[PDB]
Curated annotation (Swiss-Prot), chain B:
This is Large ribosomal subunit protein uL15. GO terms for biological process: translation. The modification N6-acetyllysine is found at K46, K54, K109. The modification (3S)-3-hydroxyhistidine is found at H38. SUPFAM superfamilies: Ribosomal proteins L15p and L18e. The keyword Acetylation applies. InterPro entries: Rbsml_uL15_N (IPR027386), Ribosomal_uL15 (IPR030878), Ribosomal_uL15/eL18 (IPR021131), Ribosomal_uL15/eL18_sf (IPR036227), Ribosomal_uL15_CS (IPR001196).
Curated annotation (Swiss-Prot), chain G:
Keywords: Acetylation, Cytoplasm, Isopeptide bond, Phosphoprotein, Ribonucleoprotein, Ribosomal protein, Ubl conjugation. GO terms for biological process: translation. The modification Phosphoserine is found at S114. Component of the large ribosomal subunit. The ribosome is a large ribonucleoprotein complex responsible for the synthesis of proteins in the cell. This is Large ribosomal subunit protein eL28. It is found in: Cytoplasm. The modification N-acetylserine is found at S1. Its main location: cytoplasm. Coiled coil: none annotated. One of its GO terms (cellular component) is cytoplasm. The gene is RPL28. There is a cross-link at K57, K64 (Glycyl lysine isopeptide (Lys-Gly) (interchain with G-Cter in SUMO2)).
Amino acid sequence: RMIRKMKLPGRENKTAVVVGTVTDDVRVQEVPKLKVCALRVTSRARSRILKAGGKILTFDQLALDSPKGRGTVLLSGPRKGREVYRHFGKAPGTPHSHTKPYVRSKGRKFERARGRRASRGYKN
Amino acid sequence: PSRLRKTRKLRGHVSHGHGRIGKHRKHPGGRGNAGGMHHHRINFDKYHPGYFGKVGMRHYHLKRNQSFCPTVNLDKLWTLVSEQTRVNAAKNKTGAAPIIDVVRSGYYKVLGKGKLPKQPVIVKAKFFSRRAEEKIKGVGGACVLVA
Amino acid sequence: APSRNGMILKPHFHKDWQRRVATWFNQPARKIRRRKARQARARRIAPRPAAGPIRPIVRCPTVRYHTKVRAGRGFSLEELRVAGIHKKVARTIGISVDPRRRNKSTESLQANVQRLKEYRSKLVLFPRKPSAPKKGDSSAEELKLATQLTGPVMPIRNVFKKEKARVITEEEKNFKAFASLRMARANARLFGIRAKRAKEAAEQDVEKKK
Amino acid sequence: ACARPLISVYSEKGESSGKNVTLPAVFKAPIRPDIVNFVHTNLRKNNRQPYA
Amino acid sequence: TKTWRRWHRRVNTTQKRYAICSALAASALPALVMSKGHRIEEVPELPLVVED
Amino acid sequence: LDDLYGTWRKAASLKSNYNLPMHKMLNTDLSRILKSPEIQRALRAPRKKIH
Amino acid sequence: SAHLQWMVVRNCSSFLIKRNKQTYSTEPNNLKARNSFRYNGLIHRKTVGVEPAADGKGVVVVMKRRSGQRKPATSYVRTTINKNARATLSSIRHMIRKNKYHPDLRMAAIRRASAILRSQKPVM
RNA sequence: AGACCCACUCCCCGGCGCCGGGGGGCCCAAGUCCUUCUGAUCGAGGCCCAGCCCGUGGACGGUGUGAGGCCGGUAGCGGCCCCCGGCGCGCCGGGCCCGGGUCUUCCCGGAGUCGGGUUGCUUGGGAAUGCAGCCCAAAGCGGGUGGUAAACUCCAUCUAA
RNA sequence: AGGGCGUGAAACCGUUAAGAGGUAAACGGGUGGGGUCCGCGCAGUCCGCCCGGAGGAUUCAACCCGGCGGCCGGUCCGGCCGUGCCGGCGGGGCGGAUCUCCCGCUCCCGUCGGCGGGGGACCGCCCCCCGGCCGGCGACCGGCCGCCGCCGGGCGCAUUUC
RNA sequence: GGACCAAGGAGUCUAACACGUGCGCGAGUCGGGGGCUACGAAAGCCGCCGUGGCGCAAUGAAGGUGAAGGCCGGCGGCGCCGCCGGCCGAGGUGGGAUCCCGAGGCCUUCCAGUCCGCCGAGGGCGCACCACCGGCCCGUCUCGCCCGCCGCGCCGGGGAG
RNA sequence: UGCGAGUGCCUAGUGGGCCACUUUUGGUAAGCAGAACUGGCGCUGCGGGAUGAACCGAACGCCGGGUUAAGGCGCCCGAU
RNA sequence: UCGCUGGCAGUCGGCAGAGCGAGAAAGAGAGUGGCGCGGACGCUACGCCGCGACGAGUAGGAGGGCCGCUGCGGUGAGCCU
Ligand SMILES: [Mg+2]
Ligand SMILES: [Mg+2]
Ligand SMILES: [Mg+2]
Ligand SMILES: [Mg+2]
Ligand SMILES: [Mg+2]
Ligand SMILES: [Mg+2]
Ligand SMILES: [Mg+2]
Ligand SMILES: [Mg+2]
Ligand SMILES: [Mg+2]
Ligand SMILES: [Mg+2]
Ligand SMILES: [Mg+2]
Ligand SMILES: [Mg+2]
Ligand SMILES: [Mg+2]
Ligand SMILES: [Mg+2]
Ligand SMILES: [Mg+2]
Ligand SMILES: [Mg+2]
Ligand SMILES: [Mg+2]
Ligand SMILES: [Mg+2]
Ligand SMILES: [Mg+2]
Ligand SMILES: [Mg+2]
Ligand SMILES: [Mg+2]
Ligand SMILES: [Mg+2]
Ligand SMILES: [Mg+2]
Ligand SMILES: [Mg+2]
Ligand SMILES: [Mg+2]
Ligand SMILES: [Mg+2]
Ligand SMILES: [Mg+2]
Ligand SMILES: [Mg+2]
Ligand SMILES: [Mg+2]
Ligand SMILES: [Mg+2]
């Protein structure tokens, strides 16, 4: 995400700012030069960025470098990426609601017969 | 810690937070999850569709060791070997292709999800999917099957 | 009674589970007792290996595990006689034996035979009578140098055949893995019924021609 | 910080000897009383005998 | 009270080590030792190391 | 001790895999940061008159 | 650093007294003896303390030097002043002001010195 | 078992004697120093330029409050004295005159049991997992098992009573 | 502490003292009266600066000698460190799913091909020695110089200082 | 319900699940079982002790299958597929905190012009998130035409909606 | 005309009600039984109705001053 | 109590120059030419300070307790014949 949003046009050699954690992503091959500021960076992410030739900053250094935070691109992680969010909203077993139910285990015998089929009674 | 919980704040309040009209009785709805068909019907329908009834076949003596087959994706394919291998393969102009044996890593089937870097490979797996095979062909490389 | 959205659970607490609850407060005591007994055994068998007899290479049975090797029960009679040790002498010199295990292939047989012969070359045999050396004994130079070894006598380590980079052959490029797999499935599924239809057609042919 | 000073080894008589070693980075590791407290609190219950 | 109360607690090894590093780091600041209450007004150097 | 716990660049020699924990902020001296020309430059005038 | 050590010891010091809705610090070099970041006598890079002399005449002024911060034995330099009240006050005021030595508390230093001299004066 | 080759006299126990853990018993450091409170001190102060003395002994208990040095203990791969066993040694006596490889010729197994029908109990075991009652009642390239009853046909793996 | 005897509470009772008493008693708010005690109440605060008057000191400013300390040297000299970098006709440890001389084994009439290991090269990281930049010495300084301050001792001698 | 007073006296512990908070590590994570080294039955270490759990892939009752494409150039049977080779290569619309640019302008005599800071019409790249449109994977249905070969088959694969 | 809005989780208690102006069904009627709208009581003290769950006024932190609501001003009892 | 998610690190002092409340954006801007040694308090920032509006409550919910009881680890050169 950070590389994509920093290679979006216009925002060249600006400082990416994360008030969270920068984790490593193994399904990406080439790492550009980066100027990151973050609360904490995982060890492999640090190794990748520094080997690619980037610079990692803490927020005190960011404050010293730019008190008004100008020249910065403020990012965040996907807030609804947690597995908890697929259980929310319109209740399962209600027409047009793709909500994940709470099942003890997934399989053939667990919550698949009567509110799910059309042969076994009805389908929601 | 009992210091921090709710029973300490309820000292002096008569009903202990359970109301006075409807007291805290013992089992005012039946033990466990009884009445799923009768008086908890709409709870069961509204949050547990498909709970009642049967569907499908039976398998009397099922063996997960027989049914065991982990999968890996073309995104993670290059992670299974050291990056020294990838760097040297890209650097080398002879045309030699590194061998990626996924059974050694512990995977049996290769599924092709994402991009694959422009580099020849010999992928040595047990099963393949059609799209994974076409992507490996497109990058230029071989899929060799093992038993 | 069920409440708003939640999971429906099945606690197996309807028997009298409290009259039989196995606590583990004596776990450190059991560990200390086990290791004290282990040390006592190790020093009652003075120069012999602490872990006991040598054990052979074994493949794990099922498809989930048939790529790994481990230690077995004992060396089989066939590999033991190929190596040339006697049935009643192997376990008195420190070789585990089990007469129940077969030998289906030859590579595993030969690997176990190599392991057994290397162990035999490695071991040191003290004299039965300290002042009376015999033919098969070891000499005093290594008798003064014999000692215990810790852990498994010869650790069984599974290694992978290093395979180097190769040029890609156009035949390997033209190989069609998914199609071959699906056709193998189909052939294995339709083998018998195709044979029955072939026999039936051959029969119809014989009364058409006879 | 990052700079590591040079601490002298003291003889048994009390005065400094001729030897000295650089400060290990452990003494420059971060200090967090909150989870020091957490770890102490949780580990301190592990030597406790049961009663009933 | 039953004997099968949860008497023992588990903590992660990584933060066990983190806390031990924090304690070592805090042991080498004179104000923290004084705050803890040790009388070290006449110690030559705080990370006090002696001969072997 | 530094063999036990490693340095900032060298991993621990007798741990399985351990390194020192990173710092969330390097320069903890807050007064020095606040009364610095870079930050004093980009500030408005204080309003300390009580109304 | 000073702020970090203050965060550590703001509420968990053996010099801290909490009773009667009042808070105090009994550390050696704390003027006004109150628990405060400014007046704390331990966490600061440079500090000054004012004590009664060993004998019942004069005042001892304790200065914290700059070099040996981790060497407690040679970190504080003492100076005994036994004069009249006005010259003692002038000497303390000069010591702070014209050395520019932590000047936020020269007034408190002379308050404490005057109190100590008043106590040393004979009582009726 | 026979024949031919190679190898072998290092086994055991019953007694007798000799050499290097357990049980019991008795012991092993240092202030009742000076001054001063108290009904009684184990309290308080002091004992230097060796910050009284011991400390591998500052656990505990007793003693007219509150004791490392008053007493018992505590520490020590500390000591001494008895008794029992083992691992070791030598002697006497007794028990056995014993192996392996190759070829040839022979030998080779557990029944009112297995299995089948039905009935009752049991099990997750579902056209019947296990057990039992009654009836039927075996075979020898046989028999058992291979989680759906049955027939036909190849494989695998064991050898019940 | 007087043989069911450490401490000795409440309900209840006796007596002494004070007070009160025809709407059972008790209670809230507002005063008033009377008591028991306290203030150790009973001629009522001090604190700075200045003016005036009587006093008494080893006495002030300045100067000199010594010690310590705080800040600097536009760029004084020397060190040490870097969660920095650059070099190396440098000396090593760790790792590598990066490559390739010897030994062991197996199958072949001292031989070809094969398997296990050891060795060597290469790569990455780290440690150390050499040289060069950069940054710091405000989690981490030493010496010379300059300024300032303080203390001790002389000298100061009374329109000063106290 | 209640003569009066004292003492005692009632949401606890285990397991499971769900959500919210705090900490460590982070596409991984976790030794809890085992092993090695007075308080200490603690603590430390193991990584070829990660076996294993949860997560990283879903869908189908099951056999099973399993998560972007377009363009260029010509041919074979206008287009389309394949041979090919190369090129680009991982969505779009609206709203979006923040960031970027900048018509001009912020006085101490007057003009010109420098630097720094600042404000700013208008214009941009757009986080997380919401709404909508497309796309891909599994099951199923409808309509169709091609491709593959070790076994050309009651074979295998592919397309559109 | 007035006002800062949108949005997500987890959630206790409740699921016996009663009264009043106007509308209104059964009944001779009811301090009866049953509905509609709004406001109350329940969960709420305060001034007036002598007295009162729901009536009239008005809703409540601890206080000083002033003024009113509904209701009052022979005496009880503040005010002709 | 709530809101302003208001203000305060500027205690910027002889190495000095005292300001940021006032209808109407933004410089107490830098440069180029034409004697007497002195100055209160403050800021446990989990602190201090300034304005506004508000304050009924059973069932129930939440927050704060320098309220209280017993025991453990630290600490007070704590107290006591
Ligand atoms: Mg309540
Ligand atoms: Mg509740
Ligand atoms: Mg009740
Ligand atoms: Mg209820
Ligand atoms: Mg009810
Ligand atoms: Mg309940
Ligand atoms: Mg409920
Ligand atoms: Mg005693
Ligand atoms: Mg004494
Ligand atoms: Mg004593
Ligand atoms: Mg004692
Ligand atoms: Mg003694
Ligand atoms: Mg003794
Ligand atoms: Mg002893
Ligand atoms: Mg049953
Ligand atoms: Mg079957
Ligand atoms: Mg008594
Ligand atoms: Mg008594
Ligand atoms: Mg009385
Ligand atoms: Mg009377
Ligand atoms: Mg009664
Ligand atoms: Mg959650
Ligand atoms: Mg009614
Ligand atoms: Mg009610
Ligand atoms: Mg209400
Ligand atoms: Mg009301
Ligand atoms: Mg009336
Ligand atoms: Mg009023
Ligand atoms: Mg009236
Ligand atoms: Mg309220």
